[PDB]
C-alpha cells in the first residue's frame, strides 16, 4: 500500500520588495535560490547565544 | 568536501536530528584550516557538527 498527494508552494508577490519591477513580465512564483533565499522581507531571524 | 552554490547537502546532528542543507556560497566544509589542536573538546563527529 502507498500514498500520494500533490501540494506545491509559492512565494508571495512583492516578497523581495527591493526591486521596483519583475524580471521578465511573467515569472515563476515559486521559491528558489535567486528569488527567495534570504531575501524575503516578511521574516527576520536572529540567533541567540549566551543563554 | 567543497560546496557548490545551488546544490543540496544532507546531514544528521547528534543532538537534534537530521536535516537537509542547501549551499548558497561556495566554501570548504571542514574549517578551512581550523578545528584541530586548540579544540580538545569532544569526538570527531561532535567537532563536525559544531562547525
Swiss-Prot record, chain A:
Signal peptide: none
Transmembrane regions listed in the UniProt entry: none
PTM annotation: A proteolytic cleavage by the prohead core protein protease gives rise to the mature major capsid protein during virus maturation.
Domain of life: Viruses
Free-text function comment from the UniProt entry: Major capsid protein that self-associates to form hexamers, building most of the capsid in association with pentons made of the capsid vertex protein and one dodecamer of the portal protein. The major capsid protein self-associates to form 160 hexamers, building most of the T=13 laevo capsid. Folding of major capsid protein requires the assistance of two chaperones, the host chaperone groL acting with the phage encoded gp23-specific chaperone, gp31. The capsid also contains two nonessential outer capsid proteins, Hoc and Soc, which decorate the capsid surface.
Family classification: Belongs to the Tevenvirinae major capsid protein family.
Assembly information from the UniProt record: Homohexamer. Interacts with the portal protein. Interacts with the capsid vertex protein that forms pentamers. Interacts with hoc; one hoc molecule associates with each capsid hexamer. Interacts with soc; this interaction reinforces the capsid structure. A total of 960 subunits of the major capsid protein forms the 160 hexamers.
Protein name: Major capsid protein
Segment of the intact protein contained: 471 to 521 of 521
Curated annotation (Swiss-Prot), chain B:
Highest taxon in the source lineage: Viruses
Maturation and modification: A proteolytic cleavage by the prohead core protein protease gives rise to the mature major capsid protein during virus maturation.
Biological role: Major capsid protein that self-associates to form hexamers, building most of the capsid in association with pentons made of the capsid vertex protein and one dodecamer of the portal protein. The major capsid protein self-associates to form 160 hexamers, building most of the T=13 laevo capsid. Folding of major capsid protein requires the assistance of two chaperones, the host chaperone groL acting with the phage encoded gp23-specific chaperone, gp31. The capsid also contains two nonessential outer capsid proteins, Hoc and Soc, which decorate the capsid surface.
Family of the protein in this entry: Belongs to the Tevenvirinae major capsid protein family.
Subunit text: Homohexamer. Interacts with the portal protein. Interacts with the capsid vertex protein that forms pentamers. Interacts with hoc; one hoc molecule associates with each capsid hexamer. Interacts with soc; this interaction reinforces the capsid structure. A total of 960 subunits of the major capsid protein forms the 160 hexamers.
Protein name per the record: Major capsid protein
Source species: Enterobacteria phage T4 (Bacteriophage T4)
Stretch of the intact protein here: 170 to 211 of 521
Amino acid at each position: 500500500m502507498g500514498f500520494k498527494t500533490r501540494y506545491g508552494i509559492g512565494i508571495n508577490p512583492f516578497a523581495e520588495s527591493a526591486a521596483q519591477a519583475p524580471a521578465s513580465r511573467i515569472q515563476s512564483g515559486m521559491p528558489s535560490i535567486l528569488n527567495s533565499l534570504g531575501k524575503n522581507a516578511y521574516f527576520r531571524r536572529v540567533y541567540v547565544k549566551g543563554i | 568536501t567543497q560546496t557548490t552554490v545551488g546544490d543540496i547537502y544532507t546531514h544528521f546532528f547528534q543532538e537534534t536530528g537530521t536535516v537537509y542543507l542547501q549551499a548558497s556560497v561556495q566554501v570548504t566544509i571542514d574549517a578551512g584550516d581550523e578545528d584541530e589542536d586548540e579544540d580538545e573538546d569532544a569526538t570527531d563527529a561532535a567537532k563536525l557538527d559544531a562547525e
